[PDB]
C-alpha cells in the first residue's frame, strides 16, 4: 500500500540560491548530467521525439498513421481525388449493405467476411475524413479569419450607419432651423 499520488520530484532539491547565482555564470560557460547547475537550465526536446507520458507515446509533431502502417487495408490513397474516393466509398458501403441483406436472405452464415468488408469501407471512410481534417482545419481557420474580417467590416458599416444618422439628423435640424428663421 502506497499513497494515491506520486511525490514531488527529487529535482527540487537542486533549486538553491547558490545554484541561482551560479546559473548565469554557467550560462556564460535528454541531458548528460555533469553537475548541479544542469538542473536549472530547462531540458531540451528528446532527440527521438517520442516521449513516454501517462502510459502512451506522444510526438512533438503528430502524423496521421496509414492503414498499412497500422496493419489494415488502405483501399484508395488536390483533394478532388479524395472526394471522389469518398463518393465511391459511400456508394460501395450502401451496395455492400444491400449485399449483406442478400447474404442473410439466402444463407445467414457467409456474412462474416461481408461484415469485414463493411468494416474496411468504414475505416477507409473515417481515415479519409481524418486525412481531410487538416485541410478542414485550415478551412476553419480561413473561416475564422473571414469572420473576424466580417466583424471588423460590420463595425465599419455600423460606424457609417450611425454617422449617416448623424448627417440626416443634421439635415433635419438645418431644415427646421431654416423653418424657424
Amino acid at each position: 500500500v502506497s499513497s494515491l499520488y506520486p511525490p514531488p520530484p527529487p529535482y527540487v532539491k537542486f533549486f538553491t540560491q547558490s545554484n541561482l547565482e551560479k546559473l548565469p555564470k554557467y550560462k556564460e560557460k535528454e541531458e548528460e548530467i555533469t553537475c548541479a547547475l544542469d538542473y536549472l537550465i530547462p531540458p531540451p526536446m528528446p532527440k527521438n521525439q517520442q516521449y513516454r507520458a501517462f502510459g502512451s507515446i506522444w510526438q512533438v509533431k503528430d502524423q496521421l498513421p496509414d492503414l498499412e502502417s497500422m496493419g489494415l487495408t488502405q483501399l484508395y490513397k488536390n483533394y478532388q481525388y479524395k472526394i471522389q474516393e469518398l463518393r465511391k466509398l459511400l456508394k460501395s458501403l450502401l451496395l455492400n449493405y444491400l449485399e449483406l441483406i442478400g447474404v442473410l436472405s439466402i444463407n445467414p452464415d457467409m456474412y462474416e467476411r461481408k461484415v469485414e468488408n463493411i468494416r474496411t469501407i468504414l475505416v477507409n471512410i473515417h481515415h479519409l475524413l481524418n486525412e481531410y481534417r487538416p485541410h478542414q482545419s485550415r478551412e476553419s481557420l480561413i473561416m475564422l479569419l473571414e469572420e473576424q474580417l466580417e466583424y471588423k467590416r460590420g463595425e465599419i458599416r455600423e460606424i457609417e450607419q450611425v454617422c449617416k444618422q448623424v448627417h440626416d439628423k443634421l439635415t433635419s435640424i438645418q431644415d427646421t432651423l431654416r423653418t424657424g428663421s
Partner: protein
Amino acid sequence: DRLTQLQICLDQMTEQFCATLNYIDKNHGFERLTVNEPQMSDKHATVVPPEEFSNTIDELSTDIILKTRQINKLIDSLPGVDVSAEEQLRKIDMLQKKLVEVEDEKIEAIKKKEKLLRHVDSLIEDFVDGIANSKK
C-alpha cells in the same frame, strides 16, 4: 463543423441499419406455405398486421435513403474540395494581409469618428458657454 454532421450522418446510417435488422428480426410473422398447414400463435411473439408491417418496412427504407440524400448533399457541400494545402496557405497569407489592412482602415475610420466626436462636442461646448455668458 460539416465533417461533424457527416460523422453523425454516418453512424446514423449504421444505427438505421441495425434498427431495420432488429425490426425485421423481431416483428416478422409466420408465413403459410399452404392453407392446410396449422397456423399457431405465441403470446411471447410480437405479432403485427402484415400490411402495416410492410408499411413500416417502407418507411424505414425511405428514411434510410433520405438520410442518404442528406449525406450526398452534405458531401457536395464540404468546405474546400478544389483547393490544396498550398492553396490554403495562399489564402491564409492574403487573409493575414487583408486583416492587417482592415485594422488600419478601422484605425482611420475610428479617426474619422473622432474628428466628428470633437467636432460635435466643440459645437456643444461653444453653444453652452455662449448661452452661459449670455444668460449670466
